[PDB]
Each structure stands twice: as structure tokens, then as C-alpha cells.
Design a protein around this ligand. Structure first.
Ligand code: SF4
Length: 83
């Protein structure tokens, strides 16, 4: 059960960015974003994930202010995490 402020799939930013809460159900292979082989990409290894927002598997994303993503998710703005 998702948190009350989870990003929903038909949010227009979720549509534009092809966000999915489950990276295995995402377009990561198609997008081929640089930094890691596509099958390795998910929110937890993305620079925009906020480790200090949310709890557990439901964490912040700088691109979805006020909402929570799933650490196991993905979107087309996936960017290799610096830390
Ligand atoms: S920008 Fe990064 S943390 Fe935010 S939803 Fe996309 S892949 Fe996940």
C-alpha cells in the first residue's frame, strides 16, 4: 500500500518522465541513460533521490516536491548518484 502522497502514474510529470514505482516495469532499457547499465538503474542510485525525505522504501525525489517515490522505482530523469 503506497503512502498517501506517492507519485501516481498519471501525474503529468510521471507521464512525461515515464516514472514507475517499480523499475522492473519501467522504460529504463529504452532510455539508455548514461552512468550505469540500464538494468542497474533505480531511484536509490539516482542523484535526485532524497535520503532524508520519507521513510523506508518511500523517499523523496527533488523533481516531485511534496510527494514520495519508491526507492525501487525509476524515471527518465535518472541521473547517477554522486555519493
Ligand atoms: S529523478 Fe531519480 S529519484 Fe526521482 S523518480 Fe526519477 S529516477 Fe527516481
Amino acid at each position: 500500500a503506497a503512502p498517501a502522497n506517492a507519485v501516481t502514474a498519471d501525474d503529468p510529470t510521471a507521464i512525461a518522465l515515464k516514472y514507475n514505482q517499480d523499475a522492473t516495469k519501467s522504460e529504463r532499457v529504452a532510455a539508455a541513460r548514461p552512468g550505469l547499465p540500464p538494468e542497474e538503474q533505480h531511484c536509490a542510485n539516482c542523484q535526485f533521490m532524497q535520503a532524508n525525505v520519507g521513510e523506508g522504501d518511500w523517499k523523496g525525489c527533488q523533481l516531485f516536491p511534496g510527494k514520495l517515490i519508491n526507492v525501487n522505482g525509476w524515471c527518465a530523469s535518472w541521473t547517477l548518484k554522486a555519493g
